[PDB]
Design an enzyme around this catalytic site. Structure first.
Site, mmCIF file in Angstrom:
data_model
loop_
_atom_site.group_PDB
_atom_site.id
_atom_site.type_symbol
_atom_site.label_atom_id
_atom_site.label_comp_id
_atom_site.label_asym_id
_atom_site.label_seq_id
_atom_site.Cartn_x
_atom_site.Cartn_y
_atom_site.Cartn_z
ATOM 1 N N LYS A 44 41.947 26.638 37.711
ATOM 2 C CA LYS A 44 42.695 28.026 38.771
ATOM 3 C C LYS A 44 43.074 28.994 38.186
ATOM 4 O O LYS A 44 43.582 29.120 36.922
ATOM 5 C CB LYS A 44 44.177 27.247 38.909
ATOM 6 C CG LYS A 44 45.408 28.518 40.472
ATOM 7 C CD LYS A 44 44.858 29.065 40.515
ATOM 8 C CE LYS A 44 45.915 30.089 40.860
ATOM 9 N NZ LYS A 44 45.217 30.617 42.722
ATOM 10 N N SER A 45 43.302 30.271 37.986
ATOM 11 C CA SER A 45 43.409 31.365 37.181
ATOM 12 C C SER A 45 44.580 31.413 36.925
ATOM 13 O O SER A 45 45.097 31.186 37.663
ATOM 14 C CB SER A 45 42.876 32.985 38.004
ATOM 15 O OG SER A 45 41.608 33.340 38.440
ATOM 16 N N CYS A 131 44.255 41.273 41.075
ATOM 17 C CA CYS A 131 45.580 40.969 40.850
ATOM 18 C C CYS A 131 46.384 41.238 41.838
ATOM 19 O O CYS A 131 46.225 42.193 43.235
ATOM 20 C CB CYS A 131 45.557 41.809 39.495
ATOM 21 S SG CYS A 131 45.618 44.046 39.791
ATOM 22 N N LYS A 165 34.613 37.803 37.460
ATOM 23 C CA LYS A 165 34.981 37.234 39.289
ATOM 24 C C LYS A 165 35.106 38.889 39.992
ATOM 25 O O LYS A 165 36.209 39.170 39.997
ATOM 26 C CB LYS A 165 36.074 36.212 39.083
ATOM 27 C CG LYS A 165 36.243 35.831 40.650
ATOM 28 C CD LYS A 165 35.332 35.081 41.184
ATOM 29 C CE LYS A 165 35.758 34.348 42.991
ATOM 30 N NZ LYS A 165 36.439 34.068 42.522
ATOM 31 N N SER A 196 38.246 37.268 47.487
ATOM 32 C CA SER A 196 38.213 36.965 49.032
ATOM 33 C C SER A 196 37.832 38.670 49.701
ATOM 34 O O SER A 196 38.379 39.248 48.602
ATOM 35 C CB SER A 196 40.256 36.226 49.238
ATOM 36 O OG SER A 196 40.303 37.078 48.388
ATOM 37 N N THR A 273 36.717 27.249 51.081
ATOM 38 C CA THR A 273 37.892 27.580 51.511
ATOM 39 C C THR A 273 37.228 25.726 52.434
ATOM 40 O O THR A 273 38.306 25.219 52.822
ATOM 41 C CB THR A 273 37.340 28.378 52.948
ATOM 42 O OG1 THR A 273 37.968 29.754 52.350
ATOM 43 C CG2 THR A 273 37.698 28.053 54.643
HETATM 44 C C1 LIG Z 1 43.690 28.642 48.433
HETATM 45 C C2 LIG Z 1 42.817 30.272 47.103
HETATM 46 C C3 LIG Z 1 43.211 30.469 45.767
HETATM 47 C C4 LIG Z 1 42.552 30.285 45.651
HETATM 48 N N1 LIG Z 1 42.750 31.626 44.577
HETATM 49 C C5 LIG Z 1 41.893 32.459 42.766
HETATM 50 C C6 LIG Z 1 42.184 32.181 41.802
HETATM 51 O O1 LIG Z 1 42.973 31.377 41.441
HETATM 52 N N2 LIG Z 1 40.736 33.250 41.243
HETATM 53 C C7 LIG Z 1 39.668 33.364 41.803
HETATM 54 O O2 LIG Z 1 39.457 34.440 41.057
HETATM 55 N N3 LIG Z 1 39.846 33.233 43.407
HETATM 56 C C8 LIG Z 1 40.940 32.644 43.849
HETATM 57 N N4 LIG Z 1 40.586 32.883 45.188
HETATM 58 C C9 LIG Z 1 39.058 32.709 45.698
HETATM 59 C C10 LIG Z 1 38.148 32.010 46.017
HETATM 60 O O3 LIG Z 1 38.043 31.640 44.489
HETATM 61 C C11 LIG Z 1 36.933 32.284 46.352
HETATM 62 O O4 LIG Z 1 36.331 33.736 45.918
HETATM 63 C C12 LIG Z 1 36.735 33.478 48.145
HETATM 64 O O5 LIG Z 1 37.986 32.048 48.856
HETATM 65 C C13 LIG Z 1 36.241 33.453 48.740
HETATM 66 O O6 LIG Z 1 35.408 31.857 49.217
HETATM 67 P P1 LIG Z 1 34.856 31.270 50.362
HETATM 68 O O7 LIG Z 1 34.275 32.134 51.697
HETATM 69 O O8 LIG Z 1 34.089 30.445 50.706
HETATM 70 O O9 LIG Z 1 36.774 30.696 50.122
HETATM 71 C C14 LIG Z 1 41.323 32.232 46.029
HETATM 72 C C15 LIG Z 1 41.183 31.359 47.350
HETATM 73 C C16 LIG Z 1 42.126 30.154 48.200
HETATM 74 C C17 LIG Z 1 41.355 30.220 49.150
HETATM 75 O O1 LIG Z 2 48.751 39.919 45.991
HETATM 76 C C1 LIG Z 2 48.562 39.162 44.844
HETATM 77 O O2 LIG Z 2 50.156 38.162 44.913
HETATM 78 C C2 LIG Z 2 47.421 38.178 45.035
HETATM 79 C C3 LIG Z 2 46.191 38.279 44.487
HETATM 80 C C4 LIG Z 2 45.209 37.888 44.131
HETATM 81 C C5 LIG Z 2 45.344 37.656 42.701
HETATM 82 C C6 LIG Z 2 44.867 36.907 41.987
HETATM 83 C C7 LIG Z 2 43.996 35.499 42.462
HETATM 84 C C8 LIG Z 2 43.857 35.389 43.234
HETATM 85 C C9 LIG Z 2 44.308 34.635 44.561
HETATM 86 C C10 LIG Z 2 45.894 34.506 44.741
HETATM 87 O O3 LIG Z 2 46.320 33.490 43.687
HETATM 88 O O4 LIG Z 2 46.318 34.586 45.737
HETATM 89 N N1 LIG Z 2 44.047 34.441 45.854
HETATM 90 C C11 LIG Z 2 42.478 35.086 46.872
HETATM 91 O O5 LIG Z 2 41.863 34.573 46.993
HETATM 92 N N2 LIG Z 2 41.989 35.507 45.030
HETATM 93 C C12 LIG Z 2 42.408 35.858 43.784
HETATM 94 O O6 LIG Z 2 42.021 36.026 42.559
HETATM 95 C C13 LIG Z 2 46.925 36.815 43.086
HETATM 96 C C14 LIG Z 2 48.135 37.382 43.154
#
Ligand SMILES: Cc1cc2nc3c(=O)[nH]c(=O)nc-3n(C[C@H](O)[C@H](O)[C@H](O)COP(=O)(O)O)c2cc1C
Ligand SMILES: O=C(O)c1ccc(CCc2c(C(=O)O)[nH]c(=O)[nH]c2=O)cc1
Ligand SMILES: Cc1cc2nc3c(=O)[nH]c(=O)nc-3n(C[C@H](O)[C@H](O)[C@H](O)COP(=O)(O)O)c2cc1C
Ligand SMILES: O=C(O)c1ccc(CCc2c(C(=O)O)[nH]c(=O)[nH]c2=O)cc1
Lengths: 313, 313
Positions: A44-45, A131, A165, A196, A273
């Site tokens: 997790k980030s 962020c 990323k 996303s 997802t």
């Molecule tokens: C619940 C959730 C949490 C995520 N948290 C992060 C994160 O902490 N760091 C990150 O780089 N991307 C995060 N993402 C983005 C995913 O790594 C991925 O880039 C995005 O969901 C698109 O891929 P998918 O179509 O397979 O869901 C998160 C996505 C979801 C759904």
């Molecule tokens: O709007 C926010 O509060 C927000 C947006 C993006 C991030 C970075 C961590 C992250 C998250 C997340 O922890 O909400 N979700 C993603 O789809 N991609 C991510 O990279 C963290 C927080």
């Protein structure tokens, strides 16, 4: 047939891993991804200090994909570093650690600490440029001068090969500018495309309501909605960054979808997802499916078709 | 129960119309849209000179939507001006004329000549800002200084109320900036959210090939892929531009999808991909479907629910 590959001086049994944020926040989650048939895992980030993240509900899924505004909930950098340094079984698969500090200084502070663990254990860094919103300025990867600063400072502080990323881009001039930035940094060895698709809005007709609580229902989209966006960014960066690897992420539910990512240029394929929805059994299915499509086509290796998407005339 | 609206000094039977580019290029197309049950129509985005557009294949549709790089094929401004001045029956429904000059000067030239026809006949201008300016720079609406210039020049040249067709944005900071630019221009009375989601890439697994010929297969996405992105933009602008109308465009295939747009803040609702795929009979279905949701909920008029999406706490 087997799907084994090498990159970044690591060996991988197959190209599949979780997407950062999915099934990777707790020691439990990391052990579960390790136990899976994925070729790798990413944590997790993290931020320097723990975070509770945003109020619930903060994730929802639907037939076509997901929306989230998690708010970077994580157990803090010390936890993930300890996992990498003491707990992870590197004999099972490689580990990537995702960092997402809220400033450049916070990222520098984390990577300085990570560097010796990377040297000693081989953990890999994925630097997350997304962020929380800060009113008055754009996301880092949408501010090319900020991006260049982050990469210059992290490169200097870390000193070892790492990845970044990226959020999706939608404009060819943006692809050209972003790739030019990335190519200034020789330590950036992989680019993961994509995070996303930012700030969508899902509304439930029956309740006449948004479906997540934070941000007035606005959140990042994943899943089937974003596959063609993800493929375009994978390919755009594969074409623009010939000395880097590209990792694909977005919209993978099947071996076919993975096949398309690899055709577009992906080395590793990350699953967000669909993993959240199906659980870690998905990895055996994706492997089986990808190997079946290869067999039907006569491909014995991933290298025989990576980046080989055909254009018309 | 009633789908009527009265806005921009016109009366509309219902909120549905085509999206610019679909079923609106030739006199035959425009007469077909006028014959349909739509509450309005918009002509194909035009340029000073006629254009053949890009090589084919340049549009493809699939279960989840469409991709296109048409290249702005159109019969030229004079044709659409003549349609507006001499051919269109305004007793059937209102007409919008979409303009997409390839430079600010081109747009100024067109709007100067459209003005007297707009004044006399009531044709309504939709200025397309999601289009190219200089190759290697972003599209106009992604270059906020260019956007401001285009709007200053067009407002001065035209001198009458008009609207603007916007690309989708993905960053809150861009919603903020973009709406602030728009709000500098009191003659911008409506904002149409959204044009296609730019530069996606669809790949056909069997042939290992992109599906459109221009731009190495990259093109704008429409349809089911883009509904949450469309809703987000409609609502973002609805919230930020309280003195303007918002028209919704993106992912409408059903009366429920239209209902969500309208809850988000949409006045008119435009239909692109689904209309391309189904043909103009779609409008009767969309009307019927929207009225059935209204009946179930006890809503008698669109204004009883427009912009009334609920947030959580
Ligand atoms: C619940 C959730 C949490 C995520 N948290 C992060 C994160 O902490 N760091 C990150 O780089 N991307 C995060 N993402 C983005 C995913 O790594 C991925 O880039 C995005 O969901 C698109 O891929 P998918 O179509 O397979 O869901 C998160 C996505 C979801 C759904
Ligand atoms: O709007 C926010 O509060 C927000 C947006 C993006 C991030 C970075 C961590 C992250 C998250 C997340 O922890 O909400 N979700 C993603 O789809 N991609 C991510 O990279 C963290 C927080
Ligand atoms: C074939 C095609 C042609 C298009 N041409 C234009 C155009 O000339 N001007 C414009 O503003 N938008 C154009 N668009 C964008 C549509 O107006 C619309 O914004 C986009 O397709 C999203 O709506 P949808 O999801 O209903 O397709 C075009 C779309 C398609 C598929
Ligand atoms: O890449 C290009 O060459 C390009 C991009 C956008 C436009 C403007 C017309 C237009 C078109 C088009 O004619 O390609 N397609 C869309 O989905 N939306 C539009 O607004 C025109 C050309």
């Amino acid at each position: 047939m087997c799907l084994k590959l090498n990159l970044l001086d690591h060996v991988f049994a197959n190209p599949f891993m979780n997407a950062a944020g999915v099934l990777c926040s707790t020691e439990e989650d990391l052990r579960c991804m390790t136990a899976s048939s994925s070729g790798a895992l990413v944590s997790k980030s993290c931020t320097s200090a723990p975070r509770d993240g945003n109020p619930e509900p903060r994730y929802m899924a639907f037939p076509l994909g997901s929306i989230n505004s998690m708010g970077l909930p994580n157990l803090g950098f010390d936890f993930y570093l300890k996992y990498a340094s003491d707990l992870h079984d590197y004999s099972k698969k490689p580990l990537f650690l995702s960092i997402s500090g809220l400033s450049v200084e916070e990222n520098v502070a984390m990577v300085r600490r990570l560097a010796p663990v990377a040297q000693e254990k081989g953990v890999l860094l994925e630097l997350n440029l997304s962020c929380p919103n800060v009113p008055g300025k754009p996301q880092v990867a949408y501010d090319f001068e900020a991006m260049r600063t982050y990469l210059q400072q992290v490169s200097l502080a870390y000193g070892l090969p790492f990845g970044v990323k990226m959020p999706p881009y939608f404009d060819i001039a943006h692809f050209d500018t972003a790739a030019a930035v990335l190519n200034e940094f020789p330590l950036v060895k992989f680019v993961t495309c994509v995070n996303s698709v930012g700030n969508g809005l899902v509304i439930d007709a029956e309740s006449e309501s948004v479906v997540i609580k934070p941000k007035q229902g606005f959140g990042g989209l994943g899943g089937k909605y974003i596959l063609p966006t993800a493929l375009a960014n994978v390919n755009a960066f594969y074409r623009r960054c010939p000395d880097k690897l590209v990792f694909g992420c977005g919209g993978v539910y099947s071996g076919e979808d993975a096949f398309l990512h690899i055709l577009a240029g992906a080395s590793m394929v990350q699953v967000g997802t669909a993993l959240q929805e199906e659980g870690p059994g998905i990895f055996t299915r994706l492997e089986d499916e990808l190997l079946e499509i290869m067999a039907r086509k006569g491909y014995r290796t991933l290298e025989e078709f990576r980046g080989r998407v055909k254009t018309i005339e």
